[PDB]
Design a protein around this ligand. Sequence first.
Ligand SMILES: Nc1ccc(S(=O)(=O)O)cc1C(=O)O
Ligand SMILES: Nc1ccc(S(=O)(=O)O)cc1C(=O)O
Ligand SMILES: Nc1ccc(S(=O)(=O)O)cc1C(=O)O
Ligand SMILES: Nc1ccc(S(=O)(=O)O)cc1C(=O)O
Ligand SMILES: Nc1ccc(S(=O)(=O)O)cc1C(=O)O
Ligand SMILES: Nc1ccc(S(=O)(=O)O)cc1C(=O)O
Ligand SMILES: Nc1ccc(S(=O)(=O)O)cc1C(=O)O
Ligand SMILES: Nc1ccc(S(=O)(=O)O)cc1C(=O)O
Ligand SMILES: Nc1ccc(S(=O)(=O)O)cc1C(=O)O
Lengths: 402, 402, 726
Amino acid sequence: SEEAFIYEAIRTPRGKQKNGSLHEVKPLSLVVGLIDELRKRHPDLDENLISDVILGCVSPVGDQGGDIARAAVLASGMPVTSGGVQLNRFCASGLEAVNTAAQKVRSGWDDLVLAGGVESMSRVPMGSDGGAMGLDPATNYDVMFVPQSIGADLIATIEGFSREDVDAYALRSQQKAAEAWSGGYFAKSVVPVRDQNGLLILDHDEHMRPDTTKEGLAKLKPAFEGLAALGGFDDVALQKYHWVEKINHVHTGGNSSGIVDGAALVMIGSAAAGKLQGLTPRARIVATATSGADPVIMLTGPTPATRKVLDRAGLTVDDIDLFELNEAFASVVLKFQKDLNIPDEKLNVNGGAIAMGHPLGATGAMILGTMVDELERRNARRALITLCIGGGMGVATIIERV
Amino acid sequence: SEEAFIYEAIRTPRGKQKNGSLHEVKPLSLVVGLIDELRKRHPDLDENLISDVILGCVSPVGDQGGDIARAAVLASGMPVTSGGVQLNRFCASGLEAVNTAAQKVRSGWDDLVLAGGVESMSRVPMGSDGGAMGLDPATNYDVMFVPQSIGADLIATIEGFSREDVDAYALRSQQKAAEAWSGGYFAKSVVPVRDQNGLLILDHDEHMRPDTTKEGLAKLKPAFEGLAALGGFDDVALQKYHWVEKINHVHTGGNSSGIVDGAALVMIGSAAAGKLQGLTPRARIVATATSGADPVIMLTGPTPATRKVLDRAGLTVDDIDLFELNEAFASVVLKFQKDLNIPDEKLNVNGGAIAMGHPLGATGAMILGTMVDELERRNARRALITLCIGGGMGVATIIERV
Amino acid sequence: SSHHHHMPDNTIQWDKDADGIVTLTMDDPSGSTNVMNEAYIESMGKAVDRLVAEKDSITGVVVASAKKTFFAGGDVKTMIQARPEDAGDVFNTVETIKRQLRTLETLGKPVVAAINGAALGGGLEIALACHHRIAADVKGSQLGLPEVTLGLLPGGGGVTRTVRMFGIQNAFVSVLAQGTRFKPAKAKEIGLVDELVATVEELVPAAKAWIKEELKANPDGAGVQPWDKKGYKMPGGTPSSPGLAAILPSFPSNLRKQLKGAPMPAPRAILAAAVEGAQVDFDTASRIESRYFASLVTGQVAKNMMQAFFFDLQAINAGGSRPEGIGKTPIKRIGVLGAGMMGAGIAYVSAKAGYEVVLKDVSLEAAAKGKGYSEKLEAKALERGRTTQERSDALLARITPTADAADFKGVDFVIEAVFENQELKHKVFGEIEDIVEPNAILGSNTSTLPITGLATGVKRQEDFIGIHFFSPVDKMPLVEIIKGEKTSDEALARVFDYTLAIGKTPIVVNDSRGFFTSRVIGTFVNEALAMLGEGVEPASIEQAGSQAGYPAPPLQLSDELNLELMHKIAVATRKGVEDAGGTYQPHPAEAVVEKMIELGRSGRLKGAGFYEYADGKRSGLWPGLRETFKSGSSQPPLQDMIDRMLFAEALETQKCLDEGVLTSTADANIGSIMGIGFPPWTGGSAQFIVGYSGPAGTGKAAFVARARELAAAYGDRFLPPESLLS
Ligand SMILES: Nc1ccc(S(=O)(=O)O)cc1C(=O)O
Ligand SMILES: Nc1ccc(S(=O)(=O)O)cc1C(=O)O
Ligand SMILES: Nc1ccc(S(=O)(=O)O)cc1C(=O)O
Ligand SMILES: Nc1ccc(S(=O)(=O)O)cc1C(=O)O
Ligand SMILES: Nc1ccc(S(=O)(=O)O)cc1C(=O)O
Ligand SMILES: Nc1ccc(S(=O)(=O)O)cc1C(=O)O
Ligand SMILES: Nc1ccc(S(=O)(=O)O)cc1C(=O)O
Ligand SMILES: Nc1ccc(S(=O)(=O)O)cc1C(=O)O
Ligand SMILES: Nc1ccc(S(=O)(=O)O)cc1C(=O)O
């Protein structure tokens, strides 16, 4: 039973969508820069023992097409035997890559694997890749496709989360993110991005608004830009959730995840491969799980995926020190907290995607590394990382500090 | 840890690129049709025990974007907890999906997984997804990119395979595919495609030319379509392989893999999963391996991948009863046969992609299931399946009949 | 592949003129209209074969018709009989039809459609295969693709060609999704027709003139459709165009929003065929369209709608329920009693048909307001372009408001529409009966009170008759004609003819409490109120009504029917059998009706019902509803809520047929669809039985089984009657 260990976990700063610092940077450059950072931390490391590079990417087209993981292996001069595979499980892609790397180590047919994700949403916007669940009428009509934000509004309606409730969570996410940055929690894992001359492009999470007030959040208009304003989706959602009369549209750009650019890498390997390369393990992958829920509400798959990974590890909520759930929408996190009775001070303790951003394919790997650091900074033992997914899926991972 | 077993392995017929029978069929429909066939073969199977659907897809755009594996779960009405993830490792994506499914079972954190791939190249041509390389001249220039067909001509030049040698292999592939079809070898695994009315669309591999003659193959002109016929790629290849003076362009449409549409599904699970659902195991995944070689020659990575998977299973070439290597190009197979001294009667014994086609994302699972059927038919024990990959990668898998 | 598909009397006349222009004149000897039937396919097969064989001596083609219309409709008799095993034959048939049109379309020479009259469905599909369309701007002519109204789709290339001409969105919304018919001016405006001529006699000359000038000015483009040119750009882009890909996922959701989630396979199949066809070449797109067409034809919904909207409706319009042998009687002057919502609407539809109308009420102020209903409607119609000023002034001038019974002098057709009260109706008729002509129809618009009782208040009872309209009268398409026991066959046929003249559809019903429409829609409303009392969420009840296919959810309709009036109908139906020595089992809804009244929430007219009302507009369900009825305490499946309402009406309709209230299933189907809003996809509350499909299966047996499953769970009112059993 080969146990899998996290030896490094790093990420770029998240650059904002409009007039963002990373808009001029190709998403491949974001991955290569993180590869170069792992090299500086381990120039001794025999890269021949790295058997695969697994990158999550939700929109693998254009700048992100052609197996961007392989392009990273080749452009960074890694050995040609280091593989390179792209995977897309929507929002979970970054964590699915980590979990798949862990399962490949447990199976014993890989020894040392790089895993993470990349998403340059300012260059490759969400939905750039097409798809049948949206652009095939027969399939769209049957599965009752609804954009994710309306599922979030529907969750707030069913659970009774008011506009002030979701805005209260948005404010705390901005505050906890600013405190983590000012406290220096992120100084070692956020690798600043530089150009081909070494000049600085970005060294911090641009999307944050650390001066957010509850008065400013109340001024924002509910979501009106993008797919959710084209019409019909409220009626489609209420045709399935036929017992609620009207959707309370509580979510804005201020209490929803930011559209950003970024990348993240995680080094995963067996205990033998670790000591063979002089690497100090940072944490252990205890268990992983994948579960789902209705694709119309779409954002309630985290709860069964969290229970499943807890049953698998023989643990319960009281055994977990830190809970990290991606802040796609404030109601999704409040629903998750209510469902599992998560203590407030254990949940997304360093802020989340509302403040810092949600670069689809990379987010799962980013918030996993965020928990690797925070467990170590607190001398705490266990953390549970989970994300909701489009189409009604969910993924969850439990890590244990070493 | 946990042994992984193949319980079912089916595939669609491969429709040809030009005026093909499957051109009017959406790639999602190809996958759903196979899902429906697995239901017909196991009507009482508790689909809630299926934890993931892993599909290989090399051009995940348009009809193949938006995580087509998840779309297949939702379109076919599978349980919404059944996941769905798309992956791309170029030509080995189909076998990589099976391998990843096997490793997820071996990890113990999955029990029953559908794996395979889909590629509708008549609707979504190769390169449709762009690529982090071709759109990046700085990357393209540094990695010395060369299309796969020129590496195949270069392999033939270096190894001494003449135009008659590769055309001779193309002939044996057309002959053995016809013999397999006539002998009814494919009767129960090739699932005919039907429309929404049940009308037949295609029931055979219509790319086959069973009346192929050496005289006819000798009349074909060398590869003149796609990227390769553009400028500069020979000079780029010979700049790296500087001891080679001239590339012998021996590969044509008649000795290269066919551009086709198709899909494939494989049911993989633990012994307990099969016992619980009353599934009979057909074969066992003995070992998998990933490796590679230079990306400019590109197509010699199967040799260390095969050596590594034999090394991983404590086996030698003598122990393997059947060798299945994807017929991307004739010189690639001849090089693999020359390198490992593969007995000619053990190699691609039922024909290959030159006769039947190479639907990128699906081919790996197609030729894998082809060997499950033939090990059973011959009552043989072991088979090794492998595919070359773009960018210089390779994937191999050893299965053992149960 | 062939232009033929394996007797049929040839349907197309051939003429090659001196210049080589071949005129194909379509003239089916078996009917008044050219129809896309087996004879047409064989004839156009010969004609297209010959156009190819004589290509060296042919310079152009003109498609014309010797009928009053151009070409209208298809082979419904064959399509309604197509079983699932016949899907190959249906597919091959439209595949053959389109090979003929595709050959015609790509001969290398121009083809012009001389459209002398209506070109509907397959008729327009023929013209869309031509390169130029000239239409005579005559009265009555219409152009469009109304296949969706029969549960089908334009499977003869209409989907593929209109999408190539207009793009996915415009073709679907404007032409395909609703099968809208257009008069020649609108047809040219939107691009279905290229140019117009004033008379049919100019058509073939204009066609040959266009062929000649097209050959001279565009010799390389003559006979080449836009989508057959290399630089063809589909309007609005292809599904791969980033601009169209951004909004394309909203098209199925807007479709679900408009259809409210009801079963509508044909619009879904049209949208899929439209988008799927825009992703591939024209020939592949055309075959995809054939497969979706065969998918609809072999499905039950298309057979429900072909039965109702083709066979039942034509049997009704041909006089199925009109008494045999009766002749025609003119209507010179209509007298309408009462100028409320009903009387004002009756006065409008009557004057719009050309009848002189005297609109009487108790005061000239009231009657003038009644005519104001017609003038608000004409004002809206004028500014929107649906009518001219000359025709609008003539309409309104036919309505004479009055308050004097003397102004009914010369009225030969009385339509009374005052308050529902036996004695008021007796007196109102008594003081006009001697003023109107001695042959005047004495019609009463009542929804409850039996006609035989109202008729006793007139001397000439053989001319008294029920003429039941539905509000808003200008938009509701049915007239329920109730035959009293003394009503003559002549009075019945005179009202029957009036109904067709005002452009509505008649059913003939024998006198009985609730007649057909009121009695049946009462079961639909009562079933919902029962569900509310059982503790089902009001929002779920309303969703069940819309997803069942009803035009209005049932609680919303209950507020508009007024709960006080619903109580009266119940109080008057109890006496109607206890004062006649019988048993009356209260409906569960009456408890819900009576408690809403107890709370002062009697409906919309009072300003408070199941909904809150503000500014003449509905504004959400009353929040005190959930506490009052313990909403949420009962959560049955939505399909059980849907079936409970659909089955209640389907069973009550069968009762009406068993008691002789109705005399045909055609009246039951069209009467339910047009009268009270029974979902069109069902084909009617009677067709709903023969075509029911669910878990068990399809047919009358499956309906009985599901009705028995409903009776076990929700009450014995769902038990099927003896007539539906073996
Ligand atoms: N193995 C490690 C790699 C990186 C870091 S960090 O740079 O402090 O984040 C810490 C450790 C550790 O052992 O705690
Ligand atoms: N700086 C801290 C160190 C340790 C812990 S705890 O003991 O794991 O709770 C918490 C904190 C905190 O900042 O809240
Ligand atoms: N979508 C489903 C398909 C199959 C099955 S099962 O195989 O009958 O368990 C269950 C479900 C479910 O939604 O629970
Ligand atoms: N478990 C099986 C499923 C399918 C088939 S096949 O249809 O003959 O390919 C055979 C077996 C077997 O036991 O050999
Ligand atoms: N029909 C055969 C059965 C068995 C075997 S063997 O046992 O793998 O040698 C080979 C063949 C063959 O066709 O060559
Ligand atoms: N009522 C009809 C609606 C549509 C069509 S069709 O679309 O031309 O087939 C025909 C008719 C007809 O009765 O002839
Ligand atoms: N404005 C009303 C209209 C109708 C009715 S009721 O239907 O007779 O209850 C009552 C009122 C009222 O205000 O009392
Ligand atoms: N037919 C039913 C009526 C009532 C309820 S209950 O209100 O949830 O008890 C449930 C059902 C059901 O089928 O689940
Ligand atoms: N009661 C009926 C009267 C007339 C017809 S009809 O001649 O088929 O229209 C059918 C029925 C029936 O009950 O099915």
